[PDB]
Amino acid sequence: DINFSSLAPRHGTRPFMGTWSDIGTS
Amino acid sequence: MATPSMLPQWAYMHIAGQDASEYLSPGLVQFARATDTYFSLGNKFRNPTV
């Protein structure tokens, strides 16, 4: 129609006893 | 006597431990999966969220 379409298509994983994961690894 | 309860009571009263799918026996968890459409047992168990 009038366009929008953007990142985060589903749930952002976080092990729900807590609210995080990591920044990645390096 | 019996004077206190202290700090790991916070991970036993379920305000810092595991979901009510990890601390419950895996028989009661399976029963709950299968019975939720006519009897609900989900609002009787804690989920910590930290």
Partner: protein, 177 residues
């Protein structure tokens, strides 16, 4: 004779004015009862027991040795010195080439000299601070203390440094003003 394992004392965080002292038993452990039958008591008072073990190994992996609970002055070696890296700032002018150009040259605020210089002097030093409890060390050195058989012995073996109105430099309790 039984005392079980008492509720662990925890030293007051007192603001900035003075030196850390005084302590009191917890307020995150008191409960309603006349509710829990004897099965749940066993769990309740071995959860408590377990907690004491945790505290008695945070008094050995974060607390530094002392002969006083509150020494009232911690040495230079026993407080974290916040020391940053040396600071070096270049010296831009050449002091001997301006007095050889200002003879007929005039200058508004690197072309006539190749020289550059630096200045350091170790700009981060200072003579060690050695007052009360360290910057990051209140939590480290005052993890809750558990008094297994409380008030057994005679004075001179009591922890009178759990009393906030105590002075340990006179061994006297004074009337607060």
């Amino acid at each position: 004779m039984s005392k079980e394992i008492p509720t662990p004392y925890m030293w007051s965080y007192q603001p900035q004015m003075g030196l850390a002292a005084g302590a009191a038993q917890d307020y995150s452990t008191r409960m309603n009862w006349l509710s829990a039958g004897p099965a749940m008591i066993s769990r309740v008072n071995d959860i408590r027991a377990h907690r004491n073990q945790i505290l008695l190994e945070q008094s050995a992996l974060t607390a530094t040795p002392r002969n006083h609970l509150n020494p009232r002055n911690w040495p230079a070696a026993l407080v974290y010195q916040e020391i940053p890296q040396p600071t070096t700032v270049l010296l831009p002018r050449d002091a001997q080439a301006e007095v050889q150009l200002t003879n007929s040259g005039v200058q508004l605020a690197s072309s006539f000299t190749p020289r550059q210089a630096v200045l350091t002097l170790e700009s981060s030093s200072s003579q060690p601070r050695s007052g009360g409890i360290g910057t990051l060390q209140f939590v480290e050195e005052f993890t809750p203390s558990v008094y297994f058989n409380p008030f057994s012995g005679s004075p001179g073996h009591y922890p009178d440094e759990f009393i906030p109105n105590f002075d340990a430099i006179s061994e006297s309790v004074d009337g607060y003003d």
